[PDB]
Each structure stands twice: as structure tokens, then as C-alpha cells.
Amino acid sequence: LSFHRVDQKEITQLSHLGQGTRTNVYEGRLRVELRVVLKVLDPSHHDIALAFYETASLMSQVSHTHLAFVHGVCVRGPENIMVTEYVEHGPLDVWLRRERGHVPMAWKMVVAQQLASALSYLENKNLVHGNVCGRNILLARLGLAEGTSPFIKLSDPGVGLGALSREERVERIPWLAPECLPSLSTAMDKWGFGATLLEICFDGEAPLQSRSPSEKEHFYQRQHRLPEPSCPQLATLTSQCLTYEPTQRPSFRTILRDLTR
Numbered sequence: 001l002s003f004h005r006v007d008q009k010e011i012t013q014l015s016h017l018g019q020g021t022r023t024n025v026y027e028g029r030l031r032v033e034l035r036v037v038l039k040v041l042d043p044s045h046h047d048i049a050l051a052f053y054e055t056a057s058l059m060s061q062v063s064h065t066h067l068a069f070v071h072g073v074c075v076r077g078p079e080n081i082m083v084t085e086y087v088e089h090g091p092l093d094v095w096l097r098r099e100r101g102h103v104p105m106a107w108k109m110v111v112a113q114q115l116a117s118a119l120s121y122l123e124n125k126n127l128v129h130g131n132v133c134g135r136n137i138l139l140a141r142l143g144l145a146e147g148t149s150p151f152i153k154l155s156d157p158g159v160g161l162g163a164l165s166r167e168e169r170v171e172r173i174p175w176l177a178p179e180c181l182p183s184l185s186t187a188m189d190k191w192g193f194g195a196t197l198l199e200i201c202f203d204g205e206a207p208l209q210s211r212s213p214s215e216k217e218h219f220y221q222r223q224h225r226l227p228e229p230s231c232p233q234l235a236t237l238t239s240q241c242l243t244y245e246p247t248q249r250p251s252f253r254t255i256l257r258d259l260t261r
Ligand SMILES: NC(=O)Nc1sc(-c2ccc(F)cc2)cc1C(N)=O
Pocket: 017, 018, 019, 020, 025, 037, 068, 084, 085, 086, 087, 088, 089, 090, 091, 138, 155, 156
């Protein structure tokens, strides 16, 4: 396990941004003053803290234009804090819901290509993200003004999927791949991408949102098909990604090629 150790003296904790899986998220400063995000892990069992370090270790060996940077881990008393990139306009799901009306199809396709390019890179390195969702897509540039285009960053997955409870995996439906509800393959990120595409198509509203945890579980148990976008070309892709059999999902090379044409 390889990650930088950040001394508590080098960080300043600012305002609460919200909550992640077993975390409290804050804006912060990192003395080098760099604007950062601090993911403070709740007091937890060693297994959860080990899964949290494993994410920081995974994020430290990769580099990509559309992957949010991890500066390291800070231990402040009994708290584990991952120090991460501050991305200006924040999570995409929140932005899309707040942003009046819908964004253009062309804007949505750029975000989709950028995310597919990041996942293509992890696929080639044989590395699992395991938490692909609108909440984990961060908006660096709005790209709404003439001549401009959006710029996203896929954030770290947080506490690894292997350490979470069945309740947390259920809360993760429909982003969570169905084989993960009861192995850790890159196939799971093709499902997460497919569910993120729908979530973006539906302006930050994810399918099965209003449903209860037993309804979500039953939906995957009865292997019901997720909704499709109106565009037949996009419909083919999202249904191909959102295939229950993981070996039938397309590679990110194919997904990226399909998205560009
Ligand atoms: N690197 C990284 O993940 N940065 C994050 S996470 C986050 C957030 C997380 C959970 C919430 F409930 C609300 C906001 C914001 C930002 C940011 N602005 O960069």
C-alpha cells in the first residue's frame, strides 16, 4: 500500500460540504495554500479504515485528465482523512438537478466521452473504481457559454465496495452492478457507467430513486431491465452496459467509439 502521509499541521478544515459513504466531506486548505477537499472517515473498525487506505493507495498509482487527484492521507487523532482535489462546481447530480431545465444533448455526450475515456484507462490498467455515479462526477468547467465545453473529474471511489454492508450496496442500486449485491471485476464499472449515462439523461434523477430498499433488491432479483433514453443509438449502448451478465457488457474501447459516432 502506497500513499503520502499528510501531517495534521499542514491541513486546515473549513466548511461542511456534505456526507459520503461513512464520511463527512469538508472544504479545506493544504499547506505546500492549496484549496482541497477533506474526506473525514467516521470512527470505524480497522477493516473499514484499511478499505479507505486501499482507495488512497489505488488513486496514488494512477494519472488521468478526468480523475480527481488524491494528495494523501492525514491521521488527526483517531480520524482518517483523505486529502483530495477541490473541483470548482462540485458533484454533477446536484448541479444537473439545480440547473434550470435540461442541458443540451451535445454537452451530455462530452461528459459521457470524458467519463468513458477515464474508465477506458482504468480498464487497461485492470483497476476497479467500483463507485461510478453522478455524485462522483465533479464539474471543473460548466461549458455552457459559446465556444466552451464541459470538463469533468471522476472522484476516488471512497471506502471500497468489498468492505460495505448489504444495506449500503442496496442504497447504491441502480449504480451498483447486480453481481456485486451478494466479484471485484472491471465489468462492474460498465454497469456503473450505464447507470450514470441514464442519470445524466434524466437531469440528475436516477432510476428507482423513489423506491424502497426492498423494491430495489427485488428489481435486481427479478432481473428487471432499467429504463432506456429516447435516442435509439444511446438506448442500444445503455442497455448493452446495463446487461445482467457481466461478460456481455461492451469494452470501454467500444463504448468510447460508439459515443464519438
Ligand atoms: N475530490 C472530491 O471528491 N471533491 C468533492 S466531493 C464533494 C461532495 C461530496 C459529498 C457531498 F454531499 C457534497 C459534495 C465536493 C467535492 C469538490 N467540490 O471537489
